[PDB]
Design a protein around this ligand. Structure first.
Ligand SMILES: [Ca+2]
Ligand SMILES: [Ca+2]
Ligand SMILES: [Ca+2]
Ligand SMILES: [Ca+2]
Lengths: 240, 240
């Protein structure tokens, strides 16, 4: 289809169109990307991702069209530790994508250690909300929590300073305009605090014609819950 | 998801979210539900169907919500003869539905011979465009071409006289309002000729909470092409 849209105001336990990978599962009308014990407390060494089952037609070679898409979502992070890790990400990748071997911790369940920074060995665009930046392990990160745009590498093409707020929902709007090739990110907390970051990128040179979209999160030695609360997505092919 | 929408202005050969059953296939940017030869002419004894891969949440027991949906599509029928058969139908059924054994000809690929008229043995709602009504083989049909609404039986609960026009596309709008429980059908030819039929039905007592939607067509000894040209669908769970 040239156009596709779906909306999850909440996530009831009875799901049919989501692909669960790793430890991801539904609990209390929300998606818990990373594993939690019986008490709902976060645990270390966990990775999980979800993908919408229907494939999205991102671009079409034969007609020279590229999709205009928007993804609106909300999530919250919680941890008794002073340094919850590692972060959550909205991503776009090939339909057959699976959790790479050894992609836990700072790799956010998106990249393999051996090629995490080799832009030629990957096909993925992601918007990350990174809370762990230890300069001895995450050598590619700026020294502070941040929002980053990733294109085929864990070392973001760009980042902006962001504040982690335990237990507070962050609303995010990610949009892509094929005319200007701008990928825009706008995130806000309930008190009005706003964060914005933008990057120009031609998706045709990075991703195949058909892709799947979803979320990924992970925790290494340090941990926190990564709770996806709602998600709406729309995409339509346009002439460019 | 509480809401789902998709639109196929045309049908390119590169499809990823369609389930093909029987003889259905993409050809010339359209879906040919029934088999055709090399030159493009219809053949006898053929059945074919397509279904969208993502499941639709028709109703939810917990919240007591029922979906409001709309399906818009266009198709054309062509035959060297004048007695083209058997017809095409838009249908809604359980996700694992498959072509019943011996459902060719007048059963439109939707019902099995032994239970075609047993309402307690089926789970399907369909809107049929029936062009063949010979009383010896289709004992359940009125004696003239028609559009009908089928609820768990090949014997329509409501029908309206219709005119078959070889080679001309018919534009159709099917809508279901959970507030009134009315299933309305409006079909029109480019010159303005309009046909209408409706029926009150409680989808909750006929179909499961999650379903799949698609089209079916068949040709017995008499034949004609059943070409699906475009299709758009939208559904939203409402609190009525
Ligand atoms: Ca990090
Ligand atoms: Ca980072
Ligand atoms: Ca008939
Ligand atoms: Ca009939």
């Amino acid at each position: 289809q040239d156009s596709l849209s779906f909306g999850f105001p909440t996530f009831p336990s009875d799901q049919k169109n989501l692909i669960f990978q790793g430890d991801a599962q539904i609990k209390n009308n929300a998606v818990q990307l990373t594993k939690t014990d019986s008490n709902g407390n976060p645990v270390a060494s966990t990775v999980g991702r979800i993908l919408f089952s229907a494939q999205v037609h991102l671009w079409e070679k034969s007609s020279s069209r590229v999709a205009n898409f928007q993804s609106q979502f909300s999530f919250s992070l919680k941890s008794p530790l002073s340094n919850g890790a590692d972060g959550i990400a909205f991503f776009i990748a090939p339909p057959d994508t699976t959790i790479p071997s050894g992609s836990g911790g700072g790799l956010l369940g998106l990249f393999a250690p051996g090629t995490a920074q080799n832009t030629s060995a990957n096909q993925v665009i992601a918007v990350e909300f990174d809370t762990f930046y230890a300069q001895d392990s995450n050598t590619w990160d700026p020294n502070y929590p941040h929002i980053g745009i990733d294109v085929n590498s864990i070392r973001s093409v760009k980042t902006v300073k962001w504040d982690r707020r335990d237990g507070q929902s962050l609303n995010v709007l990610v949009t892509f305009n094929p005319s200007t090739r701008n990928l825009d990110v706008v995130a806000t907390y309930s008190d009005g605090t706003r964060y914005e970051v933008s990057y120009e990128v031609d998706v045709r040179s990075v991703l195949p014609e058909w892709v799947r979209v979803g979320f990924s999160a992970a925790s290494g030695e340090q941990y926190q819950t990564h709770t996806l609360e709602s998600w709406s997505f729309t995409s339509t092919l346009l002439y460019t």
